[PDB]
Amino acid sequence: CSPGIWQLDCTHLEGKVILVAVHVASGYIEAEVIPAETGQETAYFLLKLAGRWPVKTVHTDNGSNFTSTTVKAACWWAGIKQEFAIPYNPQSQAVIESMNKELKKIIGQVRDQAEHLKTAVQMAVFIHNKKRKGYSAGERIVDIIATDIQT
């Protein structure tokens, strides 16, 4: 997949909101637990992600998520463009559903090893990214980005 493409969605659990970002080419995930879905939270997460990885385009399965002035400002500042659903590449959509499915499963498995849901979500990200499938998603993302540096 292009190395600059990410998917970003929110999922719901225990009355809280989990923002889940997946780097399409590797399956690596980043997530945060946010009070409720807001354009301000989506924008803040996008700016954080773009300062950490070379984010070129972001796709989502809820296009309305990216309407607000504040999200448009964050994409403008960071130089991100939206990847328009339209025929969401079949291999790509399959990566995204699969990583999202895997994360929700892991959260459930570690949930009682943490008091708060946000702690279990980050234990689930950690497990997910370090799981060898072979290399892990964490290994794959650094390989892909590092290889992309050198034209």
From Swiss-Prot:
Could you tell me what this protein is called?
Integrase
Highest taxon, organism lineage = Viruses
Provide the Integrase catalytic domain boundaries.
1-145
How it assembles, according to the record, is: Homotetramer; may further associate as a homohexadecamer. Part of the pre-integration complex (PIC) which is composed of viral genome, matrix protein, Vpr and integrase. Interacts with human SMARCB1/INI1 and human PSIP1/LEDGF isoform 1. Interacts with human KPNA3; this interaction might play a role in nuclear import of the pre-integration complex. Interacts with human NUP153; this interaction might play a role in nuclear import of the pre-integration complex.
Q: Give the domain note.
A: The core domain contains the D-x(n)-D-x(35)-E motif, named for the phylogenetically conserved glutamic acid and aspartic acid residues and the invariant 35 amino acid spacing between the second and third acidic residues. Each acidic residue of the D,D(35)E motif is independently essential for the 3'-processing and strand transfer activities of purified integrase protein.
Its function, per the record, reads: Catalyzes viral DNA integration into the host chromosome, by performing a series of DNA cutting and joining reactions. This enzyme activity takes place after virion entry into a cell and reverse transcription of the RNA genome in dsDNA. The first step in the integration process is 3' processing. This step requires a complex comprising the viral genome, matrix protein, Vpr and integrase. This complex is called the pre-integration complex (PIC). The integrase protein removes 2 nucleotides from each 3' end of the viral DNA, leaving recessed CA OH's at the 3' ends.
Compartments reported by the entry: Virion; Host nucleus; Host cytoplasm
Membrane-crossing segments per the record:
none
Q: Where does Mg(2+) 3 bind?
A: D9, D61, E97
